[PDB]
Ligand binder design. Structure first.
Ligand SMILES: [Zn+2]
Lengths: 7, 194
């Protein structure tokens, strides 16, 4: 699984 | 206190991986120091699971394990005109972080890059996706739009968890802001650490 920071 | 912070830094010494070649050693250290504020029980669990926090001197997608994300628009980043190539941090089954991009406004609008990313790993690996549990979804439904960036934090419970986690652990000021804005989320994190 992968998740980005707040845009 | 001082001893506990040192214990956490020691744990992180077995988690954090530094890049090969030239990089900002002082800022890398600063990032580790901010991560050391995370409750030791989570850090110990990350260590036991052999989760590495990879600090990078270049793009995430220049790493072999993330090359598949080249040109891919991250979840919630639709319309930004940016792809993973442009994103300075990643958290989940792994953690990868660009040195120097910690602060809000450095290619992202998270309160702190490494805490947000590491929160995702703690959520997924340590807490077995608690952000997607019924208990947290109920809290998210009530408070998820009270920390701003509502089209991201208000939409994805795992992102609300990760950023709330970051507020809780960055410093006293953000910790206090979370308590005021999101009391049930604050209580939830408080209890989580027991
Ligand atoms: Zn995120």
């Amino acid at each position: 699984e992968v998740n980005p920071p707040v845009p | 206190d001082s001893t506990t912070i040192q214990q956490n830094k020691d744990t992180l010494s077995q988690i954090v991986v530094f890049p090969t070649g030239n990089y900002d050693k002082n800022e890398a250290n600063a990032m580790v120091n901010r991560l050391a504020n995370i409750d030791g029980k989570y850090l110990n669990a990350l260590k036991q699971n052999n989760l590495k926090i990879k600090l990078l001197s270049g793009k995430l997608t220049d790493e072999k394990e993330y090359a598949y994300l080249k040109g891919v628009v991250p979840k919630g980043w639709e319309g930004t005109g940016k792809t993973w190539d442009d994103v300075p941090g990643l958290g989940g089954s792994t953690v990868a972080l660009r040195i120097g991009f910690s602060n809000k406004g450095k290619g992202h609008d998270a309160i702190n890059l490494e805490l947000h990313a590491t929160a995702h790993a703690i959520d997924h690996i340590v807490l077995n996706d608690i952000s997607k549990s019924a208990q947290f979804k109920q809290i998210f439904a009530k408070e998820g739009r009270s920390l701003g960036n509502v089209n991201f934090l208000g939409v994805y419970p795992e992102e609300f968890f990760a950023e709330s986690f970051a507020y809780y652990y960055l410093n006293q000021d953000t910790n206090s802001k979370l308590k005021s804005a999101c009391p049930q989320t604050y209580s939830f994190l408080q209890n989580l650490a027991k």
